[PDB]
Amino acid sequence: NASQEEKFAETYNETTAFNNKVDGSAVQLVSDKADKAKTVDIYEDFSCHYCSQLAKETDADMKKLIEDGKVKVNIRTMNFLDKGEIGHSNKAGTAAYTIAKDDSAQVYWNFRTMLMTEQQNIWGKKELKDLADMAKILGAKDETVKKIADGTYSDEFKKIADDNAKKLEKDGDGQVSSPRVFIDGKEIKENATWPSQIK
Template identity: 45%
Template sequence: MSKSTKVSNPNAKGGSGFIWAVVAVIAIAAVVIGYIVMSGQGKKTEHLADRERVDVAFTSDFSDNAVTLRADNARADAPEVDLYEDFSCSYCGQLAENTDAQMQAAIEAGDLVVNVRTLNFLDRGNVDGHSTRAAAAVLAVAESGETDVYWNYRAALMEEQADIYNKWSNDDFADAAKQLGASDAVVEKIRSGENVEAADALAAVNAEKLNAETGSVSSPRVIQDGKDVNSPDINQWLDVVLG
């Protein structure tokens, strides 16, 4: 009489142990991937901690859809201008680099008042576009009254525009603000993205104002008394305004 041979399932015994081993491997992989993602995210902005900070001697008041930069000793007859800029505009970035130092000096001397008016027309209606999210981040700082942070943050976003355009998430904008000294409340407001719709609405109002006064919307623009500052080179607008 022949003996039957029973073939057993190799996974029949210890099957639960095998499943738990797979789960553990997946969990470890998730942790590693998360660590890599978080580390990479931090590296996008960690260099800003070494950026030279500029201290300013003027105040920033966020109202009427603009950030007004004015010194406490501003002359009663100091000229006042509206500076229109878009965080996706390379010419705006160049203008900021070329004229911010001179503008700061004039404001601090009490010789100039500037209303910085943010636009987002280069997003072409995309509320998640770079212009709008950058504006939301900067305006969150402006609303807090953290003037030094505002001035340095705005400058950093303008100067590094080519490297960060359409590459930063709300987390990146928040991390950058933190590196530049923004308060925890402001950082978390930026991270949440709660200010994006408000920034989009603000930019739309500014575009309407610019169009009503000049008949067109573009950037950068410097408007005084409802008209473009008459300068053949916009990089020399301060010389014209200050006379």
């Protein structure tokens, strides 16, 4: 509820030292320290439990690898859990994409963490205007908040999600599911420990 959400500003308030941009259908996270960095593709859906668990398990180790220039992470959001409808995966994904495209890496990172951590509490209960309010609490620019509420990128996001599903089908084993992690194009078997592959 509203009073709970005000406190998110304390809860989801990590600092970041990397850049964010949209590259094709990826949200690319990479720092200026990148030095022969490995490309890490992460296919995920904001309604998916195992994606939320993976984020909880790996986000701290991932953040450091990005900051230190060891990896370039492509967050490749999908929306299959909405089963073709415009549901939570699309709304949450659109909101996060809007921040990724127009706003700071720090707000993006904290918003993504929030969506994954709060997943079961918020699934199906947040419209774009509500996600916009959450983005404001987490520091998004005024225009970003407006674009989330307005669904300015809803259609763009539909294509992002479809494009990531198509890429996953081509690059993997043909199955589209999530979460999935690839390092330099090779699928990782135990996703929960992928950061430990990076030396």
